[PDB]
């Protein structure tokens, strides 16, 4: 409005809000659709759900490849949003029991899920990079606020999705049976609206063209660099001062520098999948911990499941608080948070949150009697301090990661680094699946283990981040 902020980001944040609303509304009812409409096995339903989630996490690589290597962005966003809408149409069409049965439903649902995953993986990184591209490189301070607002929009969409989804599938009869078509069609309409609002701002955007087949050039440059050193029976100057310097007979310096920055950022990001896996193991164990503690709260009775909604709400509170107060207060003094100290502090906060969870579990275990009621039975409170610490860690880490990925990426591959950021989440989610089956430790001894692991990862990332060479 006033200055320093383009009007375009309005139809970026709004589009992201609508897209997250639709995605979460659909994913909430996906499992019930599998179990009570398709009548699938529990194993089959869970496996298909996890496969869909993994494909959603892994498709942004393909999306970013398309965007940066060809077609630019705002054209991959538009086309992948069209694919997303087609997938939603197929999915909602497979929930209609009138046409076909048990074969058309399955095929249509699976095809729609595949298309939805393709769309999400390619609307995720491209949208963030495109929104960040609206600011001049000099306006590096408004970009951080834009990214904070972007994360706020994502979390708000998730929260309204949680608050609105149960109404759609509450005692509604599509055709004599439970109405899943509405549950899958409302997200489709939301995605259509998101695409419409994003396209409405076409004439205001700052569409930059791609810099050529950047992915192919990067792959070829790395291949030549690696293959040049193979001087088994010779060698005087294979490569010195770097492993890319003597990949210089081709691939001019402006490309070697870009691939250098990409490799540096990837090496920095190497350990983030472990952090994601460790931090993800809190939405399931903390529910079990809540199940063992009183939840009357005097005024309103709180169920253990309902406590999960406290994360997005605390994120919504913290993002403005961190952006407008805490960071400003820190900047008041000479203390300098370099966007890499923020991530380390977030890791430390997550470790502290898990240590507090272990302490609360230890307090829970120490219960002795005086329907008998244990005197040392904690209320659902005492879970706030760990929800506060873990939420602050997510705000400091996730919001800073989006800005760091964009700020440290070459202009030719801005959205590739955003796929690298999401790639860590995809790998971390894979680690969770592999580790989920292995569970034979006490809750208190498991939390203390996660706290120690989160500390080891923080030290590894902190040391590597200390030697990181910023892009310039």
């Amino acid at each position: 409005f006033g200055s320093s902020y383009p009007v375009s980001i309005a139809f970026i944040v709004v589009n992201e809000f609508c897209e997250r609303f639709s995605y979460y509304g659909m994913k909430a009812v996906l499992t019930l659709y599998f179990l009570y409409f398709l009548h699938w096995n529990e194993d089959t339903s869970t496996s298909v759900y996890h496969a869909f989630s993994s494909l959603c996490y892994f498709t942004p690589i393909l999306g970013a490849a398309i965007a940066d290597s060809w077609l630019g962005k705002f054209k991959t966003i538009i086309y992948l949003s069209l694919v997303y809408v087609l997938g939603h149409v197929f999915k909602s069409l497979g929930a209609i029991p009138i046409l076909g049965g048990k074969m058309l439903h399955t095929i249509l649902s699976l095809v729609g899920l595949s298309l939805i995953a393709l769309g999400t993986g390619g609307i995720k990184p491209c949208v963030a990079a495109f929104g960040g591209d609206q600011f001049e490189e000099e306006h590096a301070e408004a970009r951080t606020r834009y990214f904070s607002v972007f994360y706020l929009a994502i979390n708000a969409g998730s929260l309204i999705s949680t608050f609105i989804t149960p109404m759609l599938r509450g005692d509604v009869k599509c055709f004599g049976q439970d109405c899943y078509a509405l549950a899958f069609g409302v997200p489709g309409l939301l995605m259509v609206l998101a695409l419409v609002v994003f396209a409405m701002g076409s004439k205001m955007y700052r569409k930059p063209p791609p810099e050529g087949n950047i992915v192919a050039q990067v792959i070829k440059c790395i291949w030549f660099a690696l293959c040049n050193r193979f001087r088994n029976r010779s060698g005087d100057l294979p490569k010195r001062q770097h492993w890319l310097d003597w990949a210089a007979e081709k691939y001019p310096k402006h490309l070697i520098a870009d691939v250098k920055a990409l490799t540096r950022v990837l090496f920095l990001y190497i350990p983030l999948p472990m952090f994601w896996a460790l931090l993800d193991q809190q939405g399931s164990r903390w529910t079990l911990q809540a199940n063992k503690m009183n939840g009357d709260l005097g005024f309103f009775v709180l169920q253990p499941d309902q406590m999960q909604v406290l994360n997005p709400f605390l994120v919504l509170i913290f993002i403005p608080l961190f952006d407008l107060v805490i960071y400003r207060l820190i900047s008041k003094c000479r203390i300098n948070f370099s966007s890499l100290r923020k991530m380390a502090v977030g890791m430390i906060l997550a470790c502290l949150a898990f240590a507090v969870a272990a302490l609360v579990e230890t307090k829970i275990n120490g219960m002795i009697h005086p329907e008998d009621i244990p005197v040392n039975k904690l209320s659902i409170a005492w879970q706030l301090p760990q929800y506060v610490l873990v939420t602050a860690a997510e705000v400091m880490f996730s919001v800073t990661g989006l800005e760091f990925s964009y700020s440290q990426a070459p202009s030719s591959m801005k959205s590739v680094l955003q796929a690298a950021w999401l790639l860590t989440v995809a790998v971390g989610n894979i680690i969770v699946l592999v580790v989920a089956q292995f569970s034979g430790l006490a809750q208190w001894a498991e939390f203390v283990l996660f706290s120690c692991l989160l500390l080891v990862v923080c030290l590894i990332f902190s040391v590597m981040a200390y030697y990181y060479v910023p892009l310039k």
């Epitope: 179990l35 398709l38 009548h39 699938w40 096995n41 529990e42 194993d43 089959t44 496996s47 048990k102 399955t106």
Partner: nanobody, 123 residues
Framework: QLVESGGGLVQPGGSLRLLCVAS????????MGWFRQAPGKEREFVAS????????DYSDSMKGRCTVSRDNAKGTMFLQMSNLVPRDTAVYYC????????????????????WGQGTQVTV
């Protein structure tokens, strides 16, 4: 494997509690379901309980209100029928399906592989 059943006559509006004990491999491995076969009719679906009992399903009719529960220790499964009527005076079967990946409906006869002998609950 080697599923069994137990039940008998019930009052016009009474209730019944049918058993199903597996005398083979571990009970936590198999998905279980209940079927009924009224005289001169086709085998119908009654209720289904998944391995670990997390997921439960009942037929649209579910005359009165059924409730299927299972414990994986001792391998026993219970069906609680509440508001039985003169109808549904059928022979109730127990079906077990070993866990695997399939696209066949869990509420169909084809999903299950081993059927025990059926009781003769009558009204």
């Amino acid at each position: 494997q080697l599923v069994e059943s137990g039940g008998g006559l019930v009052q016009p509006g009474g209730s019944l509690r049918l058993l199903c004990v597996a005398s083979g491999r571990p009970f936590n491995d198999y998905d279980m379901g209940w079927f009924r076969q009224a005289p001169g009719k086709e085998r119908e679906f009654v209720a289904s309980i998944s391995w670990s009992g997390r997921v439960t399903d009942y037929s649209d009719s579910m005359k009165g209100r059924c409730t299927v529960s299972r414990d994986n220790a001792k391998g026993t499964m219970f069906l609680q029928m509440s508001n039985l009527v003169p109808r549904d005076t059928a022979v109730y079967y127990c079906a077990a399906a070993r866990r695997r990946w399939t696209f066949k409906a869990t509420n169909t006869e084809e999903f299950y592989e081993t059927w025990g002998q059926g009781t003769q609950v009558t009204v």
